[PDB]
């Protein structure tokens, strides 16, 4: 039959706390959405950028099903453009959201007579979440000017807090389970092309006066323009122009969507790492390309423009981290890395280290330890296959 696993998603005994919202991927299957609509007594079943009666006649490129519990009166916040605790600090949908938002009352499952305090929400944060960001941090929130140094008290607060789900509760203070299906619509308008069907700011990117450090890599979106891929090749003397997922001679001919240009600086012998399935200091902890990557990596020696007599220590890299980066993740944190079992309490010493370090770039240095400005062009291939469909197709 090959039906989609909405049993796993909707029927699960265990549901996530909104702050640590769960994501399941849905692909290579056939979803009967009207079976879904009758499957339970939903309180909210709404869709954005797509008609819910026409769901069975549609096919999508990507699908994700996100799962969590929030209060009844917080369900309002699981739409685009909204604000409040949940939208701002826990789960944010983008303004161009294409998908559906399903919810139902959960009070029989998720209440208890004493109270169920196992479901949590982030209360304080330094800034609002970007769309589809997830923050699982449990670090002490600093309300004032003094540091907290690992100890709670005044102006020093735990950032999470639990919902109190009683049975004898108002309906707006009762628990609600929420599924959020996110689609990518199959037929996708092309935004960047060569001679087929004014110019893209490739001079702006490749000849910027200032380039960013590798840990804080800089993404610029390229869209609604003509890509001069022939003229780029042999614009300057590039040491690298290796391309993945598409041929390096047919760039003009080709047409794609959702183009991005990621620019940064690394050592020469580290250029190797800017490519799929690679590991090392940079690929593990600074900039990671996915295995299924579709794009072009362009890099040039920069020794005349970046180095200087004393050195250029402005270009940093992340040295220590708790885990490897996910593909296309950026980490800008400057929190003390804890090497041991004792906490660090905002003071550096043994087992308590600053995670960044400067690349040393004096002009005397060999080719291995020289600066290389790297631009990574990231494409989305036009007319991608469908992955999830309805019975009617």
């Amino acid at each position, epitope marked *: 039959t090959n039906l989609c696993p909405f049993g796993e998603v909707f029927n699960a005994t265990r549901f996530a706390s909104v702050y640590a919202w769960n994501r399941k991927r849905i692909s290579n299957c056939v979803a009967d959405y009207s079976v879904l609509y009758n499957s339970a007594s939903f309180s909210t079943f709404k869709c954005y950028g797509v008609s819910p009666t026409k769901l069975n006649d549609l096919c999508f490129t990507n699908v994700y099903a996100d799962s969590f519990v929030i209060r009844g009166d917080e369900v309002r916040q699981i739409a685009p453009g909204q*604000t*409040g*605790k949940i939208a*701002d*600090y826990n789960y944010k949908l983008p303004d161009d959201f294409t998908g559906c938002v399903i919810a139902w009352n959960s009070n029989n499952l998720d209440s208890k007579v004493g109270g169920n305090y196992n479901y949590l929400y982030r*209360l*304080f*944060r*330094k*800034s*609002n979440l970007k769309p589809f960001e997830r923050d699982i941090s449990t670090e002490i*929130y600093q*309300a*004032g*000017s003094t540091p907290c140094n690992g100890v709670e008290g005044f*102006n020093c*607060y735990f950032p999470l807090q639990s919902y109190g789900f009683q049975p004898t509760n108002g309906v707006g203070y009762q628990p609600y389970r929420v599924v959020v299906l996110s689609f990518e619509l199959l037929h996708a308008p092309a935004t960047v092309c060569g001679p087929k069907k004014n110019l893209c700011p490739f001079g702006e990117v490749f000849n910027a006066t200032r380039f960013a450090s590798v840990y804080a890599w800089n993404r610029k979106r390229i869209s609604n323009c003509v890509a001069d891929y022939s003229v780029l090749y042999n614009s300057a003397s590039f040491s690298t122009f290796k391309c993945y997922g598409v041929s390096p001679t047919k760039l003009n001919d080709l047409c794609f969507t959702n183009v991005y240009a990621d620019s940064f600086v690394i050592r020469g012998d580290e250029v190797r790492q800017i490519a799929p399935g690679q590991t090392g200091k940079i690929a593990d902890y600074n900039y990671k390309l996915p295995d299924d990557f579709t794009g072009c990596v362009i890099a040039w020696n920069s020794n005349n423009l970046d180095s200087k007599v004393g050195g250029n220590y402005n270009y940093l890299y992340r040295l220590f981290r708790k885990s490897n980066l996910k593909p296309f993740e950026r980490d800008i944190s400057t929190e003390i890395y804890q090497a041991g079992s004792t906490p660090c309490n905002g003071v550096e010493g043994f087992n308590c280290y600053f995670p960044l370090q400067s690349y040393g770039f004096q002009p005397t240095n060999g080719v291995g330890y020289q600066p290389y400005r790297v631009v990574v062009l990231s494409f989305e291939l036009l007319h991608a296959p469908a992955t999830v469909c309805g019975p009617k197709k």
Partner: nanobody
Amino acid sequence: QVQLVESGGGLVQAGGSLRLSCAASGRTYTMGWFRQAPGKEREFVAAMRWSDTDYADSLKGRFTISRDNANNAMYLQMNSLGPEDTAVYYCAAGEAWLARSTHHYDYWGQGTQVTVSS
């Protein structure tokens, strides 16, 4: 880039009231009030986010922070004023909750003066 414009500050007699007002460009999020005496640092007064308030402990009962959402403006109702309340009052905006210091805010107003004689 958000722009903040204060008003309502003047001279008051002791035991009196005042109502300061801050009008914003748009997309306000967390908004709060500080005050600065001459040759002294800024001092958090009060702030609000998603209908939760936060006041400084000395002045919580007297002062009242509120928002008119339709106008995109907030107010501060200062009551029972004394000589210690005399300062330039600033209005600020940012994205952090429990913002009780300068660093937590991104955008600042011009600064309405308040003076209080006994």
